[PDB]
Ligand binder design. Sequence first.
Ligand SMILES: NC(=O)c1ccc[n+]([C@@H]2O[C@H](COP(=O)([O-])OP(=O)([O-])OC[C@H]3O[C@@H](n4cnc5c(N)[nH+]cnc54)[C@H](O)[C@@H]3O)[C@@H](O)[C@H]2O)c1
Ligand SMILES: NC(=O)c1ccc[n+]([C@@H]2O[C@H](COP(=O)([O-])OP(=O)([O-])OC[C@H]3O[C@@H](n4cnc5c(N)[nH+]cnc54)[C@H](O)[C@@H]3O)[C@@H](O)[C@H]2O)c1
Ligand SMILES: NC(=O)c1ccc[n+]([C@@H]2O[C@H](COP(=O)([O-])OP(=O)([O-])OC[C@H]3O[C@@H](n4cnc5c(N)[nH+]cnc54)[C@H](O)[C@@H]3O)[C@@H](O)[C@H]2O)c1
Ligand SMILES: NC(=O)c1ccc[n+]([C@@H]2O[C@H](COP(=O)([O-])OP(=O)([O-])OC[C@H]3O[C@@H](n4cnc5c(N)[nH+]cnc54)[C@H](O)[C@@H]3O)[C@@H](O)[C@H]2O)c1
Lengths: 267, 267, 267, 267
Amino acid sequence: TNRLQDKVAIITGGAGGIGETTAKLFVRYGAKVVIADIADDHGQKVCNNIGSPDVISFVHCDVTKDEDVRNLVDTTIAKHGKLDIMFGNVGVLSTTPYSILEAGNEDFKRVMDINVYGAFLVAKHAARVMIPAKKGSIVFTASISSFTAGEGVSHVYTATKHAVLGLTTSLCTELGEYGIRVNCVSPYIVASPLLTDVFGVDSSRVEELAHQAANLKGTLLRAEDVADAVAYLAGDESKYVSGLNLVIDGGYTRTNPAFPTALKHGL
Amino acid sequence: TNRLQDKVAIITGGAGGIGETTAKLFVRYGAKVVIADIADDHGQKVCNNIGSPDVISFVHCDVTKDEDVRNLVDTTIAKHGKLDIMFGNVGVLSTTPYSILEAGNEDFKRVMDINVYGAFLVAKHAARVMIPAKKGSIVFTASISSFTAGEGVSHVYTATKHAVLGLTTSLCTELGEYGIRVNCVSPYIVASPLLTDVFGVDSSRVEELAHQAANLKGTLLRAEDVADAVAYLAGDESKYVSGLNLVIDGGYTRTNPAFPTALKHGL
Amino acid sequence: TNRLQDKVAIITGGAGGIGETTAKLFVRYGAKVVIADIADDHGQKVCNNIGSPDVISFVHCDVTKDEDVRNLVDTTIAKHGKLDIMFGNVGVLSTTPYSILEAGNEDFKRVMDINVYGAFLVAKHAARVMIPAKKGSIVFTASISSFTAGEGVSHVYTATKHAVLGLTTSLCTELGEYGIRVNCVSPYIVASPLLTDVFGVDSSRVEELAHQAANLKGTLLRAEDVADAVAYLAGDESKYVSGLNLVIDGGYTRTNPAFPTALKHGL
Amino acid sequence: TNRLQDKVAIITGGAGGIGETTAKLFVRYGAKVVIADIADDHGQKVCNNIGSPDVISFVHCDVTKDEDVRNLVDTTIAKHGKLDIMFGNVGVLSTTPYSILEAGNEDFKRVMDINVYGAFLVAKHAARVMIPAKKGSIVFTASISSFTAGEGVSHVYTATKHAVLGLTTSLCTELGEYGIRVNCVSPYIVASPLLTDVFGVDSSRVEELAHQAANLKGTLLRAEDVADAVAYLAGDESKYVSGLNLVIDGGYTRTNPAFPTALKHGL
Ligand SMILES: NC(=O)c1ccc[n+]([C@@H]2O[C@H](COP(=O)([O-])OP(=O)([O-])OC[C@H]3O[C@@H](n4cnc5c(N)[nH+]cnc54)[C@H](O)[C@@H]3O)[C@@H](O)[C@H]2O)c1
Ligand SMILES: NC(=O)c1ccc[n+]([C@@H]2O[C@H](COP(=O)([O-])OP(=O)([O-])OC[C@H]3O[C@@H](n4cnc5c(N)[nH+]cnc54)[C@H](O)[C@@H]3O)[C@@H](O)[C@H]2O)c1
Ligand SMILES: NC(=O)c1ccc[n+]([C@@H]2O[C@H](COP(=O)([O-])OP(=O)([O-])OC[C@H]3O[C@@H](n4cnc5c(N)[nH+]cnc54)[C@H](O)[C@@H]3O)[C@@H](O)[C@H]2O)c1
Ligand SMILES: NC(=O)c1ccc[n+]([C@@H]2O[C@H](COP(=O)([O-])OP(=O)([O-])OC[C@H]3O[C@@H](n4cnc5c(N)[nH+]cnc54)[C@H](O)[C@@H]3O)[C@@H](O)[C@H]2O)c1
């Protein structure tokens, strides 16, 4: 059936990848979506092809900005008379190395802006429309680096998708005394459609590497798989779980075979 | 629609309370259930009234025992040709005080038996039938004391519904390299139907106390609310989340107003 | 004895409160300190009275800045020929309410600058001098809101002293493959000397409120008590623990008597 | 100097390995110890050679038993007039495989007995002597599997050194409203003196494998390294930290290079 039918939802990043299969799921399950990206020529060739705009519309938004998050929210109330759900994806990763010493100073500012102090506004403009109605789940989207680490992932993405659990445990302790839920989803390597910028990346040869590395040989992750975790937390069937940081790693995050797959046994 | 339709499920405690609304949900969503309790005269006046046994049957089981968990599992394969899901509830709480010093020695043995080294067998007899088919989520059921504490809850229930996350993170790291998921749900004060044994308890005057104490004024918990968290993790829409300890507290676990509601402000 | 004798340490906030009793402890335990604050007229009437500058010197630093963190580090190497320890305190809290809706937009920028993307530089200029020597613990200082929450503490302080565990778990996974440790201490209500700015605060009537609220009636917190946690992690006796977020709450963080001290018993 | 001088301590496992270098440290730092093991002919050729018995004595104890934990505690009060510290090590690991399916049924009973419902009594007989004096830290000793997992470590050791954080967070919430601290230390591969029982183990060729696997190349773990973590938490300098599960992994627990050391870069 169309499961969370009635809901009006806003994805703050539904052009790219997780965001449009999460969109297409929510419009399959009977919501009305407002995709909301800066990537203008993909975010409406996603909203032009998913459905017909009464249910799916686009809005240039730049979360690095307050007048922009103001208008997305104010025109959802005006497109559709309310805002039940605010899936707040948005996320950026470093364009400087890793290494503390030779990895810089200003792709910390900019990748804190898009990820932490830009995930906030989304929650302040949703908060100021959900609080008047005493209903709503604000889902976000972090990564398994909300929990932990990697010698890959930058000290900034480790740091900003950590605090997107900050104001999602704390945002929780007040938007909760209103019967408004605050959760975030928190994935692992997901979205292809055959990459590259430095080679390695030419994706599928990323997805193949997400199976020799996982802790759940049998399947592969996808976006339908995060969309899963997000309609759950969104509206229906989420109704008393404002806890969560629904870690979708297929278990991975809770091992380290550095010493088991060195320990081994016989040879 | 009937959502996890096809599934064969086993509740290891579906007479009592969480367990039969979780049962009635799974049989509403098109599974075939086998309720499985020692409480013989409630567990079949639950299986006699929910549905008709092709979909809902009872089996005396005593998880404190191995020949008993052997036969429940072996007759599910025989009632219905497989075991996709094993919701493993089961849980007991102290019948001695709290206080380390004057709270005893043998309602640690017995309430470790029913809760930790009796949650195990459920997972060893489900494991030995799910591994042959390379499919299945083993959901359990812990409490928010899997995470934390209370000056109420006994050092034994704090201790045994802690380890039901032991062999649910660890059970995970192997029943996972099989595309078998291992999660547990983890609730807060839930089930009435107007209690007592020492007075206080005369339940609803438990549920009323679960609203002046929560961090989500607006609703009240129930069993449909844990059943929610359990069909999610069971089969469909759980397909790459073997992480979780789906904490369903309405946020509660992540505060302490000892110092805020002492701090206050003006008077 | 003078325990971590030899060490050269840098406090990045040792004028104020935790920072100078942690300083006075490190100079009692035989280190040589460089206090390092913007508060010019307190940071040297702390360095002028603790000891004589061969062991205790001041340096205006403004962690909201890179040329400033550059020079503190470069003149420690020049005052004293190395940098074993970098205690990185620094911390600021909101000067806007709490409430998402009416609590603003730019004391998120500024109190992310001093706390997260200003805790970083401290670790990049210490990192670039500890890595050449393959020795050193970078201790930071977070709060129990690194772990959790409060209806008091702002969504920004909840968010920035969360990520000071970001780049302290992640900073760890690389400054660690160098035998350089990365930990942070993480306290609860500490430092008086009889406050006010809005009344309530007139401190001791803060400390008195840190005893009717704690989970360890018997003592009171202090700065010697965090200094404790910090010489431990600093240099000696820290030598294989790069794990920690040494939570010094006297247990507090792991309860919630909303439902126990509502549950009570007899009246 | 002799740091925690005055203290009377009890190790509940100080014959073997961690336990006697932790003993020798506490008697170096001026305590008076009572080692306390079943291994009769090692536990006194440890107490006969460390020091002279006024400071170091042995007592056959079998924590799988209550009359035994009763007498150790009652004769410490009688050897020495009190019990400030109770380091409660004790720990056993499986003598059946790993695999849920073919790994048995009764080395769960026995290795729950020595580890969880035998760590308890230690804390009930220490509790009943520390509570009369309103002073004392009960340190335990868990493993990094208190936090997480491994495809090595058995589902039972994962499960029992998990709950030794149960009744160490919960034991905390009451032995704490007495100014009695409750913490546990929580190590990684430690103690040689050149092993074997199945070959692999012939230890040092265990310790060598604890360096190609760690996240802190530079040093190696030892027992002085856990003794470190335990005098800290014991008595002095522990005075307001009843939080902790002092994870001493050299960072390890918070990564997984399954996907980084598959991701790599160029070849
Ligand atoms: N492999 C994965 O897909 C993966 C792994 C782990 C976590 N995540 C998280 O998932 C989110 C990323 O989505 P995705 O589908 O993976 O990647 P994506 O394709 O980058 O999708 C996100 C969208 O964000 C857009 N965007 C960037 N800045 C702005 C801005 N300021 N305002 C509005 N839109 C903007 C960007 O153009 C894109 O359309 C982030 O929160 C990640 O932390 C993804
Ligand atoms: N307020 C709540 O409902 C609450 C709160 C927090 C956690 N939980 C968890 O939920 C579970 C309890 O279920 P419930 O509905 O609350 O209570 P319940 O009514 O006790 O239901 C559980 C069933 O377990 C049965 N049972 C006990 N021992 C055995 C045994 N050895 N073999 C087979 N059946 C047995 C018991 O008779 C009952 O039918 C436990 O795992 C708790 O830890 C419940
Ligand atoms: N009650 C407590 O003391 C408490 C509670 C919980 C956590 N903490 C943490 O402890 C730290 C605060 O120290 P404190 O002694 O409590 O307070 P404090 O008296 O504010 O000491 C910190 C110092 O930071 C200084 N400072 C501010 N900005 C800068 C800057 N940009 N550059 C250099 N110096 C600057 C400030 O002037 C002061 O001297 C923070 O990291 C808090 O998160 C304290
Ligand atoms: N590699 C390591 O050393 C390692 C790693 C991780 C955790 N730990 C923990 O450290 C503790 C083990 O100590 P250890 O030095 O490694 O090993 P160990 O040499 O086995 O020392 C522990 C002592 O426990 C003794 N013992 C066993 N049962 C009893 C009993 N019932 N009553 C009294 N004494 C008994 C045993 O004979 C031995 O003397 C456990 O709590 C482990 O969980 C150790």
